[PDB]
Amino acid sequence: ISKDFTNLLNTLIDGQIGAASRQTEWFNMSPDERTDYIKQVDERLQEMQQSTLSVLAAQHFQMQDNPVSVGDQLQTLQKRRQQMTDVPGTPAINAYKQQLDRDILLYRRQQTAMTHFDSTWRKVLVMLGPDDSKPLNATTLRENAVDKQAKLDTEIKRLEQQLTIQVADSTFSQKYVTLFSELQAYKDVNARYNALLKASATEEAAALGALTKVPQASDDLPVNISLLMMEERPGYIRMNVALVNASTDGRFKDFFLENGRLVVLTDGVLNFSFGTAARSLAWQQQYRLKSEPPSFRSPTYTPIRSVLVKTEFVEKYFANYLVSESTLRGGFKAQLLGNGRKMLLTSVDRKVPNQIGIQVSGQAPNTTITREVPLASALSDLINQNADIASFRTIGLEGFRQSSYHPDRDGLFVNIHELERSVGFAGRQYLLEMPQDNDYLSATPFGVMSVDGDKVSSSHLSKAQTDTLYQYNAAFFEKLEQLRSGGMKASRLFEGSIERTAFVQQLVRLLERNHITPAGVLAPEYPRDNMRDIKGNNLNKVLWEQAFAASVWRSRDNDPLLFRLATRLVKNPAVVKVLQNGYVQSDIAQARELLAPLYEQWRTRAVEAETQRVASANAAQHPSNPKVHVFDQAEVERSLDDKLLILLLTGPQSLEGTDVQLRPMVEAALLSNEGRSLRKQILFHALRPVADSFSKAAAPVNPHAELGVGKIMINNRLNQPDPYLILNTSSEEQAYRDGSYLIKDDKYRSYNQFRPDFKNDATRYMNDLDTPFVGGISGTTQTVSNVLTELFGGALSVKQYWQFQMANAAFMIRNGYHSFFETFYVAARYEPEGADSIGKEMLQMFDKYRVEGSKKALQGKLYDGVMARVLPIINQGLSAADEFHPPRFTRIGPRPALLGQAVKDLPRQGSADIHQFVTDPVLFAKTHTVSAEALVRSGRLPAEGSAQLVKVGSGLYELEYTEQSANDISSSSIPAYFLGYNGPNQANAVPAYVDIPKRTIAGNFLFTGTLSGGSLVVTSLDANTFRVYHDGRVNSSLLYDNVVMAVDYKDYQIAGTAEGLAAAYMQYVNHEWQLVLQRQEYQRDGQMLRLRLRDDEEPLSIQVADSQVVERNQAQFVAYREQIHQQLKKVATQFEVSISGVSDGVYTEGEFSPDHPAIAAWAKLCAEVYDRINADTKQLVDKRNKLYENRRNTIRRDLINQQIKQLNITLEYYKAQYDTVLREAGFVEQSWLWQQIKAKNGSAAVVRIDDTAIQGGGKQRTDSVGERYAISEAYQRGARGTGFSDGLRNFREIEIPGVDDKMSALEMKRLFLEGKLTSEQQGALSGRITETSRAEYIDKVLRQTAVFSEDFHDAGSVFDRLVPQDFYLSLVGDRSGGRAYPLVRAMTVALASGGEAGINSLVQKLFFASADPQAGSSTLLRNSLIKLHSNVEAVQASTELGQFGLSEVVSRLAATTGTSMFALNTQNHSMMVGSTVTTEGRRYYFYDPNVGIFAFDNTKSLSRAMEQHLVGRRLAVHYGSFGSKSAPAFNLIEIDTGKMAEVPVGNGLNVADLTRFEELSSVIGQRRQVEQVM
Amino acid sequence: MRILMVGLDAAGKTTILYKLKLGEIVTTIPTIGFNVETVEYKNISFTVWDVGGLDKIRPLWRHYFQNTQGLIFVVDSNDRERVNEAREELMRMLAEDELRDAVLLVFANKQDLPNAMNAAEITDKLGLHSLRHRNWYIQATCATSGDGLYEGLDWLANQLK
Ligand SMILES: Nc1nc2c(ncn2[C@@H]2O[C@H](COP(=O)(O)OP(=O)(O)OP(=O)(O)O)[C@@H](O)[C@H]2O)c(=O)[nH]1
Ligand SMILES: [Mg+2]
């Protein structure tokens, strides 16, 4: 709460950042992340107070010997409380009191229960006993049978009734507890009595014993009373079952709610448990009670499903198992369920009662033989019978979804969420400081951490040390507690206090001692390359190395080499030494698990050996000792492990004799992925002892100058063992004994023992490269790699070498022993001499990048530099389909690969409610959304097909074209006439049309892509047929004739806006067509967009065929135009411009054109009002950009931000208030022109029936064939007969005359735009086009994206940003080449308007929009780069200079003054290039959308780079450049960035609007929220 | 203490702001939109928002009401044609509940100009005496000389403590 605390935290943050070197756990945060970090700080401080200092108090107190007794638990605890009811208030004290209270409640209850149990047992034995004239004996009890069995039964019945009534009691109570204990006593004594009556004369005395044996020794509870203590509410116990993973889709064992019933997703689970733990292991050790064995706590860690279940079921089946008392049970029991099924019970633990392996099984439903089989549905129904339906829950489910999201990674933890999820977890143990030593030290409540170079230990605290530790730490936390509440007044940490600085000096080392640093807790979704991990390594680089290790080590490709190595290695005698390694003994145990049945057979062999040992010990000469007359566990275990080791090294082919009978199981095992994995993990561990055993001297073959010739500076470590990472993995409770201990050597100890030695030159060097660091330069890898020629017994090929060395590097990364670099360096020193050796280059490349990294972030350039050189050696034999390719490095986190093994294999049906829609379409459309999306991102739809609905949401349905025939109406589909999408250019005379009968028989509906700023016009072609037009011009219904139905822009316009959106279609209803208009909109929905009906007006409007529509609209349009001229006159007057002489010129002559004299006055007036407002706003645009720059500054204490929102609001007001006016003025003028042209020359001058009378801005516009093809393949204008789709369906079967596989993609595209072939032939040629295109894009560019980065680097570049390979505008066809023409037009505006920050923002947008392929924003972006393919305003923004050779291009750029841009618009592609000269000298830019953006200081360097790139690697020929192969000729097109920025891309967005610091859904939010609201 | 400094365009608001903050005359620099400065004076950090007074952005003034403790309304004493426009805007501002607790300091600026209205004449033309339930003050100033400005700040500081 206190602002002082918040400022103090901000202060220490700022200061610790200012102190940062490279490699630090602090880094600068987003101003949002700031608060989440501080929140987690506060939370974990509260956790410390409640959960560790409290148990420390329970040992500073309790120091004095109060009365202590295991029986007087209640009294012992009570006196411990009254000893301390005097103690001052402190949250740790309150937690201590409350813990003691809860344990007092539980033990009070239990002691009561056991008390009334004992009194009940005594009462019932008195009731059943004979008179005292005889001793209690079986004879008198048998004589009693006929009465007292019936008495027992009657009492049982009465008790069951009365207790079932009492279950209405709201909480456990003396009466409830009484009755329960009595019932259990009655049940047990009844059973014991009946057993006595059944006992034979030899057994009779034993059962009489069992009756007289009151449990009065209190050696253990009655089982049912233990279950009573496990009850969560009176009459119910909480059952749980633990998942492997949460199985929302059925991939895993699960138990979930399905259709109101609870349902186990799988037929049995080993992981059931009952109850809940009373307290943490901390409290258990504080009481020094027996701790429950960890095999209860170890077996699982993912979310758990649980519910209360009726106790009778539990006590019926599972009380047979659940006894904690060591009654011998086998591995299994099978229990008859009341439905005739079995339940199988599994001894999953040989000691613990209350965790259970359970399987349900029974007569398989609907089978020929009564085989018992596991049955999830049976268990589900039986539970639903025995469960309460209330208080089902999943524990930690969002915890998983808020920390792992999914099964995340095959590698070590990266943040505390992945640590706490890992199998190593048990409980979060904070550490604290023991500062009164000469220097500060860390202690647990039980002990101070002894530390040594080899060893980590604890010394248990004596009382004086506890008093020290407590008094200090408590004083600190008391001060902190004051500071949060009493503030500086209470805590006196005034801004000048030296105590304040000492206090912070303590807090900082506390916040380091626990890894509460930002890298510990932030766990962001998309990792900015600034952030660093918990060890200060770069985060994103760690993620990339993890994905690399996983991909490499999961490939099956190298295995024939590794197992050849193993087959040789296994013959060496030294391999036996491997078995006594400490770490080796971790993993052969897993082999004991995988091969369980064979392992059993082995042990059945082995137990013979004990017999031979005892026999030999007796056969030994005159045995003076049972010399080996004993079961030696270690001997047999050795022999067994040796057999398992041998069976792991040599393949299953080594199996022989009787074990071949089980060999098919072993074969099925070893060929699993888990088999291969283990099968190699034992190999690399086995490797170290043999390598060591040669002791061959070091002899690196490649020298290195920077770091000492002839030696290596291996190891390079400082020992600084982390106590937190040790204790937060499960050591043995021997640490917890309150006794001095030496901690285990777990495998992670190799991850946590070491830290970099900053004194060594090698450390300084590595920090220059800024690699990750892990355990220093790997002397182990040297020691191995020196002797590979002896391990394999012969020299390796450089192929074999690099194969082994990459497998080795993957193994090393997997176990956490070293970084990539820490291995590859010595690899490069040891790469064998050979014709393709490459380490010499790699070294020189390291040096080259070192002299850079000292100044700049390399962003992975090092890793690409290596892979560029390694990969063509690896893939040297393979087919391009079979190459290995690693995941690809990016600014955002590592994305999946796009090639080779990693991809190989790595219409919606719809609802019959179609019939309701047919039956009452008016009510349906009034109450349901009808969308059209699938009719946008499919081009070239058939003229005629089947249309169906698909449902998507509440009243939300989507249309789709489908392939299924409508003549099976059960296809959920109907005969419909499709209409293609028409283009958006207002100059278009040739619209998309289709003809449909009046009183149709063949089909009764017509559908089209979504209308947005255009019109659908229906005209009556004859007595029997309509022609429906999709016209891209506004007000088009005025232009056509015989219009009987139409929807124009005004009919669906949102008032006061250009925006509108509606679905329109036709229906054949009550024997007539009806024009049905469903007004809609896009709507924002949680950082996404959706469509919806417009709710602010009647979302639907309907027209039957009428005659007056033309008059009714036309009069309105005439008036509205007059009105808008009034509007514009008003606005112009408001800005003082003279409107004199501005009026409509009578249309005299000519075609439609912009800037026709008739409208020239209006156009001038628009232009002027524009210039006034543009000059006006530019001053704020500039000052706003200046303020964003200001806010970029690192040092700023605090907000300056609100000035940005205030300028934003001001400008967007201006846009909303005036842009609409100017645009509408343009529209009404264009509309009036088109109407005049109609009125004078007739509609046939203003609508044209077909495009073959080609005309436009000029007779040709010399658009690249590529461009004119892409336009020709993303709009439909005219019909598309079905053969086109048949061709696409059969394009490989079909034959096409005059075509062969060796035509260029260009000559195919050209011949296709000749249109001579049939639609089926055009479909087939199209398919062949896409096939050829993606085969070439693969062969030419993706396989060589690496070397370009280095060419641009060492040409001398000064800044770069790679761009996402993945962003596509269509899922079908050639995805690669359609995006270039709009992208270059966006990029050139971005660069001209916002420089490097704009380029960054735009590439970020593309990355996100490619990571979320169907998110709302990525949809909007796809729909907003389209509409830049053929916008005539772009031809207004152009001037096509001639073709030019590159040298001339360079000289022209050198000649330019001020910003200028040029496209090359090569015959099939468009690079962009240009210069800025404004400040910082002249920076020259180059941009190829297939690679990335680069910049340069000088034209010599620029030309040398661009030549190397375009001709040196022949890409100009793949792009079809003009002229000779050498010295290629390009077009160029002098884009005017001054005008292009203002082109509309629909929905009121200018290209400028996508070119801004916000997201698109942000800007649209601001528009909606300031336009429709306000 | 957050200070909103408003008034019609060309009044001298920026000149006053920089005479007070920097002790200098600067006058050709534009203001359209806003200026803000932090000015330490005695115990108080005055943040003075000098917001442009062009009529077409006068409707935006209401987004600047947040956490404002003081109002400076600057009128060109030599501008008789626009003094009632200033009055209308002042009264419209005083209607806003966000400013209900704001104290009001008027600077009658440009006392050096030949037809400059004085503090009392501005007080009468603006109807300041009619302002009920409002702590207000008017100071005759010449921004270019700096006369009256610190008397204004001193008053404002004493009212705000
Ligand atoms: N003679 C005289 N001129 C002044 C005085 N104060 C300001 N001026 C002049 O008035 C003109 C406008 O001053 P500004 O500070 O820009 O006034 P403003 O209120 O910020 O004007 P806008 O930015 O348009 O809202 C300048 O030319 C100043 O020289 C003054 O006290 N005496
Ligand atoms: Mg000004």
Residue numbers in the entry:
A (entry chain A): 4 to 909, 924 to 1591
B (entry chain B): 18 to 178
From the study:
The bacterial Makes caterpillars floppy 1 (Mcf1) toxin promotes apoptosis in insects, leading to loss of body turgor and death. The structure reveals that Mcf1 is divided into an N-terminal head region and a C-terminal tail region. The head contains an N-terminal effector domain (NED), an activator-binding domain (ABD), and a protease effector domain (PED). The tail consists of two putative translocation and three putative receptor-binding domains.
